[PDB]
């Protein structure tokens, strides 16, 4: 996806490989001009998943899933059974630890497993 124009006729260069040369070269089909390639990179693309242009708003693609909610646990500060549970790592601990977030709009309490 790297396009460059040769200095002679200002036309697009096509990458090619020569077994004898054992080096990357660029030569356009308009003039018999060959230049030494740089950085040895013929394709560089940042991976993106935005293949559905102008369609992700009307149709719910669910790119960011909602966290699950459970009613078995009971909050400490308030007697509310609804909470949000998820797995995340601690500041320096190793592994995944279950976390809880209270769903009461007036409580705002979070605790670990």
């Amino acid at each position: 996806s790297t396009m460059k124009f040769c200095r002679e006729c200002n036309n697009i260069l096509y990458p090619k490989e020569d077994k004898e040369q054992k080096i990357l070269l660029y030569a356009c089909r308009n003039c018999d001009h060959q230049e030494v390639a740089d950085n040895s990179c013929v394709y560089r693309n940042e991976v993106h998943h935005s293949v559905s242009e102008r369609t992700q708003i009307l149709t719910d693609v669910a790119s960011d899933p909602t966290l699950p909610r459970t009613k078995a646990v009971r909050c400490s500060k308030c007697q509310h059974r609804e909470a949000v549970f998820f797995q995340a790592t601690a500041r320096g601990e190793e592994g995944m630890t279950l976390f809880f977030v209270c769903c009461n709009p007036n409580c705002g309490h979070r605790w670990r497993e």
């Binding site: 190793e94 007036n106 705002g108 309490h109 979070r110």
Partner: protein, 541 residues
Amino acid sequence: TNRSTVKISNVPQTIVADELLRFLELHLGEDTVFALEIPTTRDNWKPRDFARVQFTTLEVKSRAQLLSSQSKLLFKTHNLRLSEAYDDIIPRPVDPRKRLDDIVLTVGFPESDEKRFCALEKWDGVRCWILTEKRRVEFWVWESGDCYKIEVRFEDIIETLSCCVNGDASEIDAFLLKLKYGPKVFKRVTDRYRFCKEDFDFMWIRTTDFSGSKSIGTSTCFCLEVHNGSTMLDIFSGLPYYREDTLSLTYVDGKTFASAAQIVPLLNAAILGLEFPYEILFQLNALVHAQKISLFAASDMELIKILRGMSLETALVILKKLHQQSSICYDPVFFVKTQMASAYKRLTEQNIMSCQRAYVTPSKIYLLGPELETANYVVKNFAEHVSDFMRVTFVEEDWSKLPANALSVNSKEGYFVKPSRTNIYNRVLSILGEGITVGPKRFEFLAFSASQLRGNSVWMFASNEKVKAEDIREWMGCFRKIRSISKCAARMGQLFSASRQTLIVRAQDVEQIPDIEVTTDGADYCFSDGIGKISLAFAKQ
């Protein structure tokens, strides 16, 4: 009749604090209401069905109660019912005489044997409230904008004395407050249903000393500069153990005794500049910490010159004799003028060791001294540096357990509640990190036992050229294998229980035998947790 705060039973939900305040001031006297607060279930828009009102004077409260009993209070077709409240909105004394404004506050200690008082730091325009019901006295000090609250309980003050500053024996312009324990220190931090009549919309969090020179930490007495106050004697007569005698003091220039270090009440080492022994210096410092001999009375050149050249045993005997008396000694030099191997065998026979015990408080530090107690396993192989071991515990000013509110007070910031560490938390961390420097020694953290964790106590060992704290720590074992903070500390402090010595067992007489484990219903149940086997010959040995 104890307090002036009254709880109103039923009020209309549509009203605001201003309307109720206007109604009360119309029915009662003008501006006779101090604090009016209506609790809200929500943040600022859902008030409750009741309210609490604090009156300025008890007579207004009695009149309001009489009006309520006669059903003469009708505010928006609602009959207000008045009842007693559990607590006051603002801890403010009812008596206007107790409230003292714009008075000079100074701290110090009885530096000289005679009636001489040394002033460390003087604060002007402080506020003093005497709360008889709460059995405490509040001092509000404004320093660099933010104000601080100093609370002195009745138990803290051991005796009350009255003095004069103008120089007239008949006049009484000062009051000495001999404090045994340190005072609590607070700090101020930064409306539709709260009138409050003033700017009391803040909170108090416990903090360390705010003085630059740490005058409060090194001062065991408080002096209240006041006017003639002929009628003030009756108010000051309520303080416990009041002396009905007239005494005069003399101000002494004692601004030299100012330490910027965290550990305030310790003596300066550069003043000595000699080869003074560590044990005698520690005993003298512990005596100074106790309410026996003042700092300036023990910092004189004559006393240290006398104590420098003398037999060690007689010096220790006279020091413990001076410490044993309950009465305060003003001139220890006159007292000491008028007055005039085994550790290893004790360890082997009953494990008797003299362990130094230290108490760390937010205001100051208390040294108990070489108290005899039982011995652990570490001192068995480290019986040379007995004085290097020091037991350090963290308590409050009254030597009680630190409350949870004094460390990491909760606060709601943002969406969730995030705790905010107090200055006492940082002070404890700094003490654990830097360590305690007593005389020609510096104590570092070794470990804490399982029992000491509950008691908020820890062991500290002074590093020496032959052996350091890290040397002992690595001699005990390698704890890097443990990846759990609690588990590693528990294992490191596990080998500190008292035990009796016996013969040494080599590493070649060992064996590995399989254990038993059964898993039923998806539960791991192990029978062999700490069981073992022993022979009869080994048991006899």
